Design an enzyme around this catalytic site. Structure first.
Site, mmCIF file in Angstrom:
data_model
loop_
_atom_site.group_PDB
_atom_site.id
_atom_site.type_symbol
_atom_site.label_atom_id
_atom_site.label_comp_id
_atom_site.label_asym_id
_atom_site.label_seq_id
_atom_site.Cartn_x
_atom_site.Cartn_y
_atom_site.Cartn_z
ATOM 1 N N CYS A 1 42.906 35.113 41.610
ATOM 2 C CA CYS A 1 43.375 36.485 41.688
ATOM 3 C C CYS A 1 44.072 36.720 43.171
ATOM 4 O O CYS A 1 43.000 36.783 44.155
ATOM 5 C CB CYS A 1 42.191 37.553 41.715
ATOM 6 S SG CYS A 1 42.984 39.175 40.812
ATOM 7 N N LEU A 2 45.055 36.496 43.470
ATOM 8 C CA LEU A 2 46.137 36.604 44.624
ATOM 9 C C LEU A 2 47.336 37.128 44.503
ATOM 10 O O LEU A 2 48.045 37.037 43.552
ATOM 11 C CB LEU A 2 45.987 34.961 45.025
ATOM 12 C CG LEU A 2 46.779 34.790 46.522
ATOM 13 C CD1 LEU A 2 46.335 35.783 47.596
ATOM 14 C CD2 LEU A 2 46.716 33.560 46.784
#
Lengths: 153, 160
Positions: A86-87
């Site tokens: 999750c970036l």
């Protein structure tokens, strides 16, 4: 073409001046994609761990961000059981924050930043994002045991 | 004075906690404001013990639950506390607004009405509970006026 001109400065710049706790070299298995090692963030349960990442460079790169996964298993809110990250700077505008003002190093720095500081507002793992928040020591225990079986040597 | 609620919430539920809620009785205003001013992580395993001890199946858990919240809504507004503990405390008010009966949540929403009229709302994190309670009101389709009727008058009073 542009892939070559970025990757040229980047491969060279990650051999000569990589960020602290971080390395990236042209993979010996894969002489096209990059292997990184991010060494477990200080005062995080990832202490004494060496975390391998594969950085896939897209074809229209630098118009698209790099494509990174944790190849060493990681017990983390923003990282799932298959190493998915999750970036924001792994996606394009508006969902994400990749643009050409960035590079493979600035994101791999932002990766060691996320290892030290999991975000509980982008949970891939709700069990770990909850545990991280509500029983920090159980998260830190499990992630440190994780670091001893998978990120150790 | 927190560590004689952490050895109660570890053993069993509603046999030794429920007896600590009626034996202390003195005030949950000095047991939170000062117990966060020493260590914020002692104001988040206290609430994960008080809420476990005070289930909504009995009346001497629901008026404890209705007293702990009105002071916990007052301190996130009144106080100029750290932003990692307001995220922790509002991250326990959200995780516990699910299983309320009818006439307590309309009174908590009336406290919220009172906050929106006059009271100094220095942070909108106190209004984060106003969404989930308007959900939990609507799902109870029973005369406490049914859920949806109380919701419509509530939104009317918010708006006016």
């Amino acid at each position: 073409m542009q892939r070559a001109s970025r990757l040229k400065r980047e491969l060279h710049m990650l051999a000569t001046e990589p960020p602290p706790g971080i390395t990236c070299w042209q993979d010996k298995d894969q002489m096209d994609d990059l292997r990184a090692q991010i060494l477990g963030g200080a005062n995080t349960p990832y202490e004494k761990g060496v975390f391998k990442l594969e950085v896939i460079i897209p074809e229209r790169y630098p118009f698209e961000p790099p494509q990174i996964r944790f190849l060493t298993p990681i017990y983390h809110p923003n990282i799932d059981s298959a190493g998915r990250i999750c970036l924001d700077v792994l996606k394009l505008p508006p969902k994400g924050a990749w643009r050409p003002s960035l590079n493979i190093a600035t994101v791999l720095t932002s990766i060691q930043l996320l290892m030290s500081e999991p975000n509980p507002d982008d949970p891939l793992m709700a069990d770990i994002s909850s545990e991280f928040k509500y029983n920090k020591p159980a998260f830190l225990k499990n992630a440190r045991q994780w670091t001893e079986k998978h990120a150790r040597q | 004075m927190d560590q004689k609620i952490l050895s109660l919430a570890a053993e069993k539920t509603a046999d030794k906690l429920q007896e600590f809620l009626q034996t202390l009785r003195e005030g949950d205003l000095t047991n939170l404001l000062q117990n966060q001013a020493v260590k914020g992580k002692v104001a988040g395993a206290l609430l994960r013990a008080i809420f476990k001890g005070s289930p909504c199946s009995e009346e001497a858990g629901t008026l404890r639950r209705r007293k702990i919240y009105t002071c916990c809504i007052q301190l996130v507004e009144s106080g100029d506390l750290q932003k990692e503990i307001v995220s922790e405390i509002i991250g326990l008010l959200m995780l516990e607004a699910h299983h309320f009966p009818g006439p307590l949540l309309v009174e908590l929403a009336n406290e919220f009405i009172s906050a929106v009229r006059e009271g100094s709302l220095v942070n909108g994190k106190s209004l984060e509970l106003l969404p989930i309670i308007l959900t939990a009101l609507a799902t109870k389709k029973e005369n406490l006026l049914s859920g949806e009727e109380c919701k419509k008058q509530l939104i009317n009073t918010l708006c006016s």
